[PDB]
């Protein structure tokens, strides 16, 4: 996760760990909803991850009363949110050094993801540009830099460094004893965590006052 | 919420659906549907699609359907297989409803109606003008009213406009109190001519466009005609108004010595309730003339009509039109307790087929197997062109016509589906073949086990044991589904009762009915909640319980009919999955199976009875066999049994405890002999039959194959108080035999079976007199040619009567339509209907 300079900024260097092959890729995608009214904090995966988008009561409730046009305030609260989930490797962390070296999970939305994107060929021709990253032998390290000053929320000065290997890899020990600590992703996108439409309308109920 | 279709067609290059939307409103989208078929490809392009045989396949998205149709046409001349669902309407509905369809029968518009016509002949003729269209009464499950159409004048006939108050009579026999109940629904609006009232229907048709149009012989008479006529009046184009797609087609269906013509209204589902009755009412009466079926189901033959058939028009209208309602209402009355409409809907939305396709099992199953496979990314093979070749049917034992005192039958549990499972037969499960010995060599366990590793069949087919079959799998699917819903039914049932127990002394308060699932036995915390409940809610709940128990029934009867029809397809060439090697495999197995248990039974029974060679099994017909249990009776000796129940208990105790177990070890071995996949041959006692104790009754007799009668005292565990006379095809209620005579024959059999040759001889006497003095017509034969001289001949003229009612001659009019019948039963039973002049007696010693 992320700590703060007791000011609104914050720094740290993170590296996303990739899975070998035949295994759950280094990127799991999960969508969900999030709102609270009447003490009804309703936060549930959204089925928009699958070919659902309708058995998912929120999206359905969203379209049926199409709120984006008759109450934008409400829509903003119940719109579906994607959270690219990926295993990482905290490199440096001045505010919570304990995480150093340790393997964790990081919930990061759009912005950051769209950053591995422009880390390959397709971004400029003529002179060419760099190749790849997120693999244990050749990849960069995002230097998470947050800036909250008279502006608005977190910042985005983080852009990984330069193509470089991972300290102590060729070793069998740190080899498997590394992938292990990795919560390899597919449990994120599955029928493991669910719960009905009852939870939605107990939460929804009491906004109109009926 | 979730929507659902109503009808779907493929007019041209796009599907023409017609459904109930999200808000629950009827609609009619159009869709340039883009179907996708499949084609084999190298395991190089390897995808996620495969055929039942495991070959990897590849998708093929088409622009339009005709684009796809022709692909097939081409692929066929080319020489390659075109996999995938080629019935687009099927494929459409499939993609369109990728989920278990829940429907609201309410929103469905079911229209019931009949036709009233006239002619100087009697039997009108569709596909001809001469539409005199006396009257027409349409119905509508939504408004719940009858829309009667009268014709006060025209070119032929006139006057006497219906009398709402004058409900066809009173205090007599010319009214029948037609409007028995509820008159908010009869809506007499005939405008006073035909030239206009014949079209008014169209304007009506558009105000209440029919979704399900059933009535009596509507598919062949009304509609086919109600189309022809208007056509010749307002023009063909203005005749297709009966179709929400203006569109229409004709399809002539040839018969034996004759043929008619059927017309189809695209975007509609015509279910001729008669045809719905023939198929979903296992009785098969003599002649479904609806002046009997009704008198059967509702238990009354009505209208008590007295007039010249064919000419009754001028007779009246206060009694004429009154008919053109009870009719369109009686048909409605039957379905009320038969539920064949509800049955049909529950089939279609399950299959995902056009509701009017329940009359086609090949299709219904095709759909079902399709969808099951679709979900697995498996591709349904292409339907080939096989030559129609006949194959061995069932095994019916030529019984020795005789009488049988005690008899026990053992029927086999859904044999042909079970055989399919046990053997695990399917187009793709085919493993190989084997040197096949004579069917009877296997029967007698003399041929050598066909295989050591494959599941086999008496015909030479081998199947994989470690591998599920597409077909077997789907039957096991449907089978578990019947087991499933039946449980709901049983619980809703059990729940209802719990409710009914709580109706005595209900709490006197104002409350509401609980929100609970009736498919599950009420919890303790509802059994209680329910008591405190008020008596207005309970009654409401009990309705709901029933609404359930009943929904459960239907839902599980269909799963049954579904199972009982699969073989009926698997043996049909038009069926995608048809295959001779397997059509035969199934039957010839069932062949070996029956004859095998026949053996094993006789074998075991001989032993127990300390003898050898005696054939205890008197005869089986396909899946069931009948066993003579006389010798087992004697083993205890007739004189010893407290009464009749005692014996029955005894014979049930036995065969519950001694036979069935001997029967299973019998089949278990057969399973192993044929190295089957899983033993599923389950034969169980059925009916225990015999003559009352101390009675000189014959018990039961057989005169031929599927021709006999028994005195049944208990069927599948349930003991009857008053015996039941099972009578298998002895030509009793024959369509040409007077009910009076009919009933006699029934009595004759009863008495033979119970009370003996003496009693039979007494009754045979009573009825001989009881016959000599009957009615005028009734005993009368009936035929015709074109017309009769200036009923047909008798009516009565009071010139020839005196001489006729004195020169008829019951002698022949009896020993021709009772004695002939009787002769056959008694001869086989080895008795006489009238004390034969003894003979040997004169050899007095
Ligand atoms: N899976 C499958 N699809 C078929 C078959 N026959 C036709 N189709 C077509 O395949 C399309 C569906 O492909 P789909 O099942 O959505 O692929 P996935 O979505 O299963 O990969 C439908 O629109 C059908 O018209 C079949 O036998 N199996
Ligand atoms: Zn959602």
UniProtKB/Swiss-Prot annotation, chain B:
Q: Where is this region: Interaction with the polymerase clamp?
A: 839-845
Q: Where is this region: Beta hairpin?
A: 248-264
Q: Name one GO biological process term.
A: bidirectional double-stranded viral DNA replication
- Tree of life domain: Viruses
Chain positions covered by the region annotation Binding of DNA in B-conformation:
705-708
- Per UniProt, Mg(2+) 4 binds at 411-412, 623
Task: Indicate the impact reported for residue 621 to A.
Answer: Drastic decrease in the efficiency of incorporation of dGMP
Q: Which InterPro entries match?
A: DNA-dir_DNA_pol_B, DNA-dir_DNA_pol_B_CS, DNA-dir_DNA_pol_B_exonuc, DNA-dir_DNA_pol_B_multi_dom, DNA/RNA_pol_sf, DNA_pol_palm_dom_sf, DNA_pol_type-B, DPOL_T4
Residue numbers binding Mg(2+) 2: 222, 327
Region feature (3'-5'exonuclease): 103-340
Q: SMART domains, per this entry?
A: POLBc
Q: What is the effect of changing residue 415 to A/G?
A: Decreases base selectivity by several hundred fold
Give residues annotated as binding substrate: 414-416, 482, 560
What EC number(s) has UniProt assigned to this enzyme?
2.7.7.7, 3.1.11.-
Residues that bind Mg(2+) 3: 411, 623
Q: Indicate whether Lyase appears among the record's keywords.
A: no
- List GO molecular-function terms, semicolon-separated: 3'-5' exonuclease activity; DNA binding; DNA-directed DNA polymerase activity; metal ion binding; nucleotide binding
| Reactions it catalyzes | DNA(n) + a 2'-deoxyribonucleoside 5'-triphosphate = DNA(n+1) + diphosphate
Reported cofactor(s): Mg(2+)
Say which family it is in.
Belongs to the DNA polymerase type-B family.
Q: What is known of its domains?
A: The N-terminus contains the 3'-5' exonuclease activity. The C-terminus contains the polymerase activity and is involved in binding to the polymerase clamp protein. A beta hairpin structure is necessary for the proofreading function of the polymerase.
Q: In UniProt terms, what function does this protein have?
A: Replicates the viral genomic DNA. This polymerase possesses two enzymatic activities: DNA synthesis (polymerase) and an exonucleolytic activity that degrades single-stranded DNA in the 3'- to 5'-direction for proofreading purpose.
What's this protein's name?
A: DNA-directed DNA polymerase
